[PDB]
Design a protein around this ligand. Sequence first.
Ligand SMILES: [Ca+2]
Ligand SMILES: [Cl-]
Length: 496
Amino acid sequence: QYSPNTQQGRTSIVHLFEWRWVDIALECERYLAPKGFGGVQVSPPNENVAIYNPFRPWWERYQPVSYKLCTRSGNEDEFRNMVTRCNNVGVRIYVDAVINHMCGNAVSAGTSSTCGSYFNPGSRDFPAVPYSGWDFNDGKCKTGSGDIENYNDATQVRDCRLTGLLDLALEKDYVRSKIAEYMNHLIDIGVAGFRLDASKHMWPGDIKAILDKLHNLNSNWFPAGSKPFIYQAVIDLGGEPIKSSDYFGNGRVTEFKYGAKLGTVIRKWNGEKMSYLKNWGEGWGFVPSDRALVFVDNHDNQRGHGAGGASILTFWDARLYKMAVGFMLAHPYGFTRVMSSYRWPRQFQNGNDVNDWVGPPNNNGVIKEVTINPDTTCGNDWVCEHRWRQIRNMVIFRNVVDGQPFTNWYDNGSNQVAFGRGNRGFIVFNNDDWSFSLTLQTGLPAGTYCDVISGDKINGNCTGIKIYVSDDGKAHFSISNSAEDPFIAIHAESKL
Ligand SMILES: [Ca+2]
Ligand SMILES: [Cl-]
C-alpha cells in the first residue's frame, strides 16, 4: 500500500494547488523532472458545483456533482495529456479523491456545475453518476440538524453531513462500485495514487471495500502488481474517539501534528525551542514514520483554517517558513509533501481572514496561466514555493541523503542546532537572537562544498557561500541572527 511509487531516488511530492492540467504538464517537463521532484498532488479532477457567491471559492471543488473529468483545471483530454507527459518524464500524479460526499444539501438545483451536468441537492438526484436519495445517509444520521454536531461520537462523524455536505452511503456496494469505477478510470490513465479527502468521516471498513475493487497501476509505467499509493486525510490531534491508527490498514495517513508542532517550535512559542527537536518523530507522539505523510502547511490550514491553529507557518512568513520546510526535508521522518500556493487579498477582521475563501488567480472565473519570470519565479499571483531556491535545493538534499542515518547532532541548549545524514549531508540552523560561529563535526568527506541555501553549484562554481570541510570532517559555520536565511546546508552533490 504504503509505497509512493515514485522513481528511485525521488523523495517528495508537490501540491500544485488549483493549477491547470496544461500548466502542470509543462511544469513536469521543464522543471519538476530535471529538479528531482517525485510527484504532484492535483486538485480534485472531477466535476464540481460552480459557486458564484462568493465568487468561485477554492472550496467549491470539494462539492462533487459527478465523476466527469471536467473542471476549471481542464477537461479529460487535458488531464490524460498531463498524466502521460508527466509519467513519461518520471513525475507521478496523485489525485485528490473527494469520495465521502457530494455537494451541500442547501445548494440550488440546476446546472451550475463545471461541466453543465444537472443535479438536484434537494431531491438528492445526481443523474450524471447516477446517485439518488437511496445512496445517501439521511436515514442513518440521527442528529437533529442532520449534520455532525458532536465530534466525540464516532458514528455521528461518519454517518452525518460534514457541514451540510450530502453524505454518501459508502456501505452500499452500488456506491462503492461507482466510486471504484471513477478511481479505476484514473488509475488506467496513469495516476500513481490518491489523497483520500475527509477520511475521518468515512469508516475504515468502507474505504477498504472500495480499495478492494481497484486495478493495479498502469503496466506501461509501473511494475506488474503495483498498488496505488494511498494517503488518507485524517485530522487527528489526539483527544478524539477516532484515531489515525484505525486507518493504517488502508495506507498512510496525513500527520497534522507535524506542522502544528514544528510551527510552534520555530516561532518559539509555548516555551518551545529547537534544541528539543533532537528526538523529533514518533518521540513527539506522531504516527510511525512508515505510515506518515508530512508537510508544514496544506491548502486548508495555510488560510488559518484546518487545524494546527495560529502556529502554522505559511509562505506569508517566508523567512521562518523556509527554515521549517528546510528542517522537514532534512529529517528522515515520514514522506514529505511540499506546498505550492497562490496569493490572495488577505483581509483580517477580529483575527479572521474574510477572504480566506478566494479562489486561484482568475479572469472572470477563468484560471490564469502560470507564467515564468526571467528569474525563474512565477507571475500571475502564483507563489511557486517549489521554485524558491532554498526549498528546491532542500528537495534535492533529501534525495541525496535518502537512506542515511540521523547523526552528528549538536545544539546549544537553545535554538542553534545542527545534524547530519550519514556522510552525505549536513545542515545547521540559528534561530537564537545572537550570532552563531562554531566549528562542528560534519561527518562529511574533506572538500569545498557550496551552501545550497544561499546559492547553487554550477559547473565547479558556487553562486553563494562556500563551506570548507577539513580532513577530519570539521568545518566552520558562521550565521548572523539577522541573516536572510539563518541556516546552511551542504551535501554530497554540492561538493566541488
Ligand atoms: Ca461520511
Ligand atoms: Cl492534506
